[PDB]
Design a protein around this ligand. Structure first.
Ligand code: CL
Lengths: 242, 245
């Protein structure tokens, strides 16, 4: 009816098929993941969607997804804004570890906590971690205060540092009538969804947004979903992601 | 070696090998042009260049060049700012016409004026032009005042609407120590070059920046180049385009 917001979670990354925890590691899209973005774009193109501004993280997999979509819908000229605040949730020490092995050393129970709990952050990424410098010392996050640069994040944490950007940067745009497109990650996107739908912690915990599929929201003048989220795509894909 | 400014002119476009006047037409890079950007990006990667902010036009060929470079140098996370003010010069009615035919139909002389004169704009793009709507009615330029949206531009006009961006938006960044990367078009880039080097009109009219090659400027405390523009890449590439000047 009124405001339409589109979200898109990047597809499979190189570390995804390596079965590793990525978090803030700047893993790139895998060929398949790239293809996913390509199809999502095609969906938006066929549905004839138009955007006015784009927001994404400072991570390849998301940015590249955005680029692919913009390319697909012939809107590479749209202004885009990058922000670490839309970054995937920081997985602390688990970063780089193989999920299967981690479950084996620490067990299912423990790993479900680390991945599916709302406010229990994973172990901190210590200075001796294989990716400490790679992440925490990346030029990219130079302007984060010492408190801002996380060593690990729980979904509640991720969400806590995202909503601010959504409130000072995205919301304004939506209110001015700008059709926004957000290309981000599972957990950061969860933050937006939880906020929009006012879902409980338990709820958002069980929600898993589809990858590469355009998620469309129709908001009323108060940025509230006048109906449930819908996914653009071919009968199979769309229905399948339900 | 104080401030570092890097400029890059997009490579061959689809209309380039079709030998057509593009102007504001959003022609995409040709496979070759894409490869150029890739090589250009690779040169920057080998030279280990780092940037903090990027500026480009609202035209595919330039934007895609930027993307390719950022990808090559693993800096896709850099903030990028798009602006029509860095757009290629608007070629008015000549837009879409074949250059060879235009020369034949209007005469070498007339075209050389439209193609190389400093202040003689080409014929205006009339509402019945094949690309009138495609260009002028593009959502993309919706916020341009009736005066800003051009129907044609002389090199002089282009520079006129590019410099204000350069001074108001880019210069500040450079002065704050941010390493800037500008991926644009021949004529808009000319505007920057003419300004930096204080070249004469006759001067910049003759200057033809290389395509796909990273152009490096070293500016002093007052954005004044301290040496001639250098080009990045393997000898055969740099030397080939070096010999141009
Ligand atoms: Cl971009």
């Amino acid at each position: 009816a009124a405001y339409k917001l589109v979200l898109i979670r990047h597809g499979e990354s190189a570390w995804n098929l390596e079965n590793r925890f990525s978090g803030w590691y700047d893993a790139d899209l895998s060929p398949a993941g790239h293809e996913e973005a390509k199809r999502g774009g095609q969906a938006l193109r066929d549905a004839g969607y138009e955007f006015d501004i784009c927001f994404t993280s400072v991570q390849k997999r998301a940015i590249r997804t955005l680029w692919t979509v913009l390319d697909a819908i012939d809107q590479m000229w749209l202004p885009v804004v990058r922000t670490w605040r839309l970054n995937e949730r920081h997985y602390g020490g688990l970063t780089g570890l193989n999920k299967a092995e981690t479950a084996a050393k620490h067990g299912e129970a423990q790993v479900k906590i680390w991945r599916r709990s709302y406010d229990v952050p994973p172990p901190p990424m210590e200075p001796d971690h294989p990716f400490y410098s790679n992440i925490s010392k990346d030029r990219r996050y130079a302007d984060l205060t010492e408190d801002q640069l996380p060593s690990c994040e729980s979904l509640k944490d991720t969400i806590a540092r995202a909503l601010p950007f959504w409130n000072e940067e995205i919301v304004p745009q939506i209110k001015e009538g700008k059709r926004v497109l957000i290309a981000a990650h599972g957990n950061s996107l969860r933050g937006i969804v939880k906020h929009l739908e006012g879902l409980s912690e338990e709820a958002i915990m069980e929600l898993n947004l589809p990858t590469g599929i355009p998620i469309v929201y129709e908001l009323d003048k108060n940025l509230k979903p006048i109906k449930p989220m819908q996914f653009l795509g071919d009968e199979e894909t769309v229905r399948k992601a339900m």
